[PDB]
Design an enzyme around this catalytic site. Structure first.
Site, PDB file in Angstrom:
ATOM      1  N   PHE A  21       0.793  -1.223   0.000  1.00 23.66           N
ATOM      2  CA  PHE A  21       0.000   0.000   0.000  1.00 23.66           C
ATOM      3  C   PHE A  21       0.827   1.276   0.000  1.00 23.66           C
ATOM      4  O   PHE A  21       0.245   2.364   0.022  1.00 23.66           O
ATOM      5  CB  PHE A  21      -0.930   0.024   1.209  1.00 23.66           C
ATOM      6  CG  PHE A  21      -1.834  -1.159   1.287  1.00 23.66           C
ATOM      7  CD1 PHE A  21      -2.821  -1.368   0.331  1.00 23.66           C
ATOM      8  CD2 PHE A  21      -1.704  -2.054   2.335  1.00 23.66           C
ATOM      9  CE1 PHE A  21      -3.667  -2.489   0.429  1.00 23.66           C
ATOM     10  CE2 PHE A  21      -2.521  -3.182   2.448  1.00 23.66           C
ATOM     11  CZ  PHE A  21      -3.514  -3.399   1.504  1.00 23.66           C
ATOM     12  N   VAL A  23       4.246   3.710   1.493  1.00 24.25           N
ATOM     13  CA  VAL A  23       5.216   3.989   2.543  1.00 24.25           C
ATOM     14  C   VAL A  23       4.618   3.694   3.910  1.00 24.25           C
ATOM     15  O   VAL A  23       3.442   3.978   4.178  1.00 24.25           O
ATOM     16  CB  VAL A  23       5.667   5.460   2.453  1.00 24.25           C
ATOM     17  CG1 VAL A  23       6.839   5.707   3.356  1.00 24.25           C
ATOM     18  CG2 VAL A  23       6.026   5.818   1.020  1.00 24.25           C
ATOM     19  N   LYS A  38       0.951   3.511   8.332  1.00 26.98           N
ATOM     20  CA  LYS A  38       0.805   3.177   6.929  1.00 26.98           C
ATOM     21  C   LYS A  38       0.112   4.317   6.219  1.00 26.98           C
ATOM     22  O   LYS A  38      -1.001   4.701   6.604  1.00 26.98           O
ATOM     23  CB  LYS A  38      -0.035   1.919   6.746  1.00 26.98           C
ATOM     24  CG  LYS A  38       0.571   0.621   7.198  1.00 26.98           C
ATOM     25  CD  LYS A  38       0.006  -0.484   6.335  1.00 26.98           C
ATOM     26  CE  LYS A  38       0.021  -1.799   7.075  1.00 26.98           C
ATOM     27  NZ  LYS A  38       1.419  -2.167   7.498  1.00 26.98           N
ATOM     28  N   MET A  83       7.063  -2.035  16.039  1.00 27.64           N
ATOM     29  CA  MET A  83       7.939  -3.157  16.383  1.00 27.64           C
ATOM     30  C   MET A  83       9.381  -2.778  16.058  1.00 27.64           C
ATOM     31  O   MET A  83       9.746  -2.644  14.881  1.00 27.64           O
ATOM     32  CB  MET A  83       7.499  -4.403  15.624  1.00 27.64           C
ATOM     33  CG  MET A  83       6.043  -4.714  15.880  1.00 27.64           C
ATOM     34  SD  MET A  83       5.747  -5.461  17.471  1.00 27.64           S
ATOM     35  CE  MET A  83       6.215  -7.136  17.042  1.00 27.64           C
ATOM     36  N   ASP A 127      -2.517 -14.207   4.443  1.00 26.51           N
ATOM     37  CA  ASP A 127      -1.175 -14.065   3.864  1.00 26.51           C
ATOM     38  C   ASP A 127      -0.120 -14.287   4.944  1.00 26.51           C
ATOM     39  O   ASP A 127       0.780 -13.478   5.166  1.00 26.51           O
ATOM     40  CB  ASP A 127      -0.978 -12.716   3.168  1.00 26.51           C
ATOM     41  CG  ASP A 127       0.124 -12.770   2.096  1.00 26.51           C
ATOM     42  OD1 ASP A 127       0.908 -13.743   2.066  1.00 26.51           O
ATOM     43  OD2 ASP A 127       0.188 -11.857   1.250  1.00 26.51           O
ATOM     44  N   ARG A 131       7.480 -12.494   6.169  1.00 20.47           N
ATOM     45  CA  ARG A 131       7.470 -11.087   5.791  1.00 20.47           C
ATOM     46  C   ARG A 131       6.332 -10.353   6.469  1.00 20.47           C
ATOM     47  O   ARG A 131       6.388  -9.126   6.600  1.00 20.47           O
ATOM     48  CB  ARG A 131       7.374 -10.940   4.270  1.00 20.47           C
ATOM     49  CG  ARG A 131       6.123 -11.576   3.702  1.00 20.47           C
ATOM     50  CD  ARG A 131       5.992 -11.476   2.176  1.00 20.47           C
ATOM     51  NE  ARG A 131       4.832 -12.282   1.761  1.00 20.47           N
ATOM     52  CZ  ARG A 131       4.885 -13.576   1.464  1.00 20.47           C
ATOM     53  NH1 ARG A 131       6.048 -14.192   1.497  1.00 20.47           N
ATOM     54  NH2 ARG A 131       3.788 -14.254   1.120  1.00 20.47           N
ATOM     55  N   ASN A 132       5.314 -11.072   6.924  1.00 22.85           N
ATOM     56  CA  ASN A 132       4.176 -10.478   7.617  1.00 22.85           C
ATOM     57  C   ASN A 132       4.208 -10.817   9.105  1.00 22.85           C
ATOM     58  O   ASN A 132       3.159 -11.018   9.727  1.00 22.85           O
ATOM     59  CB  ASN A 132       2.875 -10.921   6.958  1.00 22.85           C
ATOM     60  CG  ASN A 132       2.687 -10.289   5.599  1.00 22.85           C
ATOM     61  OD1 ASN A 132       3.023  -9.109   5.411  1.00 22.85           O
ATOM     62  ND2 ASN A 132       2.193 -11.066   4.627  1.00 22.85           N
TER      63      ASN A 132
HETATM   64  C1  LIG Z   1       7.485  -1.314   5.674  1.00 25.40           C
HETATM   65  C2  LIG Z   1       6.526  -1.939   6.653  1.00 25.40           C
HETATM   66  C3  LIG Z   1       6.710  -1.721   8.013  1.00 25.40           C
HETATM   67  C4  LIG Z   1       5.845  -2.258   8.966  1.00 25.40           C
HETATM   68  C5  LIG Z   1       6.072  -2.024  10.418  1.00 25.40           C
HETATM   69  C6  LIG Z   1       5.022  -2.021  11.324  1.00 25.40           C
HETATM   70  C7  LIG Z   1       5.352  -1.838  12.651  1.00 25.40           C
HETATM   71  N1  LIG Z   1       6.599  -1.668  13.080  1.00 25.40           N
HETATM   72  C8  LIG Z   1       7.562  -1.690  12.150  1.00 25.40           C
HETATM   73  N2  LIG Z   1       8.841  -1.541  12.625  1.00 25.40           N
HETATM   74  C9  LIG Z   1      10.010  -1.464  11.853  1.00 25.40           C
HETATM   75  C10 LIG Z   1      11.308  -1.254  12.336  1.00 25.40           C
HETATM   76  N3  LIG Z   1      12.200  -1.215  11.358  1.00 25.40           N
HETATM   77  N4  LIG Z   1      11.471  -1.373  10.209  1.00 25.40           N
HETATM   78  C11 LIG Z   1      12.157  -1.363   8.923  1.00 25.40           C
HETATM   79  C12 LIG Z   1      10.150  -1.521  10.467  1.00 25.40           C
HETATM   80  N5  LIG Z   1       7.346  -1.878  10.830  1.00 25.40           N
HETATM   81  C13 LIG Z   1       4.772  -3.037   8.526  1.00 25.40           C
HETATM   82  C14 LIG Z   1       4.567  -3.226   7.168  1.00 25.40           C
HETATM   83  C15 LIG Z   1       5.427  -2.667   6.222  1.00 25.40           C
HETATM   84  C16 LIG Z   1       5.234  -2.897   4.740  1.00 25.40           C
HETATM   85  N6  LIG Z   1       4.257  -3.914   4.397  1.00 25.40           N
HETATM   86  C17 LIG Z   1       2.955  -3.638   4.382  1.00 25.40           C
HETATM   87  O1  LIG Z   1       2.562  -2.504   4.614  1.00 25.40           O
HETATM   88  N7  LIG Z   1       2.048  -4.600   4.138  1.00 25.40           N
HETATM   89  C18 LIG Z   1       0.593  -4.466   4.255  1.00 25.40           C
HETATM   90  C19 LIG Z   1       0.634  -6.025   4.085  1.00 25.40           C
HETATM   91  O2  LIG Z   1      -0.277  -6.394   3.095  1.00 25.40           O
HETATM   92  C20 LIG Z   1      -0.314  -7.767   2.669  1.00 25.40           C
HETATM   93  C21 LIG Z   1      -0.540  -8.638   3.874  1.00 25.40           C
HETATM   94  C22 LIG Z   1      -1.434  -7.832   1.674  1.00 25.40           C
HETATM   95  C23 LIG Z   1       2.176  -6.010   3.755  1.00 25.40           C
END
Ligand SMILES: Cc1cc(-c2ccnc(Nc3cnn(C)c3)n2)ccc1CNC(=O)N1CC(OC(C)C)C1
Length: 264
Positions: A21, A23, A38, A83, A127, A131-132
């Site tokens: 989605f 950044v 998000k 996290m 999913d 990665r999730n």
């Molecule tokens: C970049 C990112 C960070 C995070 C995130 C959340 C909480 N904490 C942290 N901490 C942290 C500390 N260092 N880094 C580098 C991050 N990170 C969560 C998701 C994403 C990207 N994926 C994404 O948005 N998706 C929606 C999903 O969709 C599919 C299931 C359909 C996949």
């Protein structure tokens, strides 16, 4: 509304990365509480459907789920638990950690507790994969972005032949007939255990998506990671029974993982 967060209460501090989605950023809520934000890029999400389901996701409260705190609907924002140690997949691939297998087992237990809770709510992740999953400052793994797949508009992600579809975490009946159920989440959990004990190796690393789907359609399976004991491999392998009905529940997988923990 109860689900809605005032975006003026957010302070944007760091970029964390980019997902389906757009950044995601790190910031603060009311100057004090860490959050991830998000920023949902235009056209990437079925937004009105997501907003209605955010009402149900808010109430999915378990210590091993990355909590949804609220949404900014007046791009729309999704505000979640932060996290500190980022994505599980990248965490596993950092060889500096020199993980013990007791630690790998505890990550599996963590994920299995989140998923036993979701299954108790008849709520499918859809999913599940490393990665999730995210890792907090104490090394705890939690399950992230559960249910969000339903609102992705990208056709490369939502079709089973698409380049972004989670083919390597999908059971045969998903790949052949699009039959999703609690037992497809079970299948994906077994692949997730395999990723953990493989320290973040791509499942079916030498195969394409198309070759993986034919492989698992002919009955063939992932094989034992070097760091998995016989008992650990039996657990992940139980997830991949060709008959969905013969796969365990998450309550049963949790009992097996707890059993094996008594051996490290
Ligand atoms: C970049 C990112 C960070 C995070 C995130 C959340 C909480 N904490 C942290 N901490 C942290 C500390 N260092 N880094 C580098 C991050 N990170 C969560 C998701 C994403 C990207 N994926 C994404 O948005 N998706 C929606 C999903 O969709 C599919 C299931 C359909 C996949």
């Amino acid at each position: 509304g109860s689900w809605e967060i005032d975006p003026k209460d957010l302070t944007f501090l760091k970029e964390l990365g980019t997902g389906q989605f757009g950044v995601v950023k790190y910031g603060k809520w009311r100057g004090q509480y860490d959050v991830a934000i998000k920023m949902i890029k235009e056209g990437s999400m079925s937004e009105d459907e997501f907003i209605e389901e955010a009402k149900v996701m808010m109430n999915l409260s378990h210590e091993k789920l990355v909590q949804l705190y609220g949404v900014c609907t007046k791009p729309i924002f999704i505000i979640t638990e932060y996290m500190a140690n980022g994505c599980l997949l990248n965490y596993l691939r950092e060889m500096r950690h020199r993980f013990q297998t007791q630690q790998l087992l505890e990550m599996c237990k963590d994920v299995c507790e989140a998923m036993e809770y979701l299954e108790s709510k008849q709520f499918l992740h859809r999913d599940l994969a490393a990665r999730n999953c995210l890792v907090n400052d104490q090394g705890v793994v939690k399950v992230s972005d559960f249910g969000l797949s339903r609102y992705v508009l990208d056709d490369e992600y939502t079709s089973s032949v698409g380049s972004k579809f989670p083919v390597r975490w999908s059971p045969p009946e998903v790949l052949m007939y699009s039959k999703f159920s609690s037992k497809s989440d079970i299948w994906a959990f077994g692949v997730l255990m395999w990723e953990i004990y493989s320290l973040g190796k791509m499942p079916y690393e030498r195969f394409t998506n198309s070759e993986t789907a034919e492989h698992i359609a002919q009955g063939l399976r992932l094989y034992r990671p070097h760091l998995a004991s016989e008992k650990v491999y039996t657990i992940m392998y139980s997830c991949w029974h060709e008959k969905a009905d013969e796969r365990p529940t998450f309550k049963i997988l949790l009992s097996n993982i707890l059993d094996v923990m008594d051996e490290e």
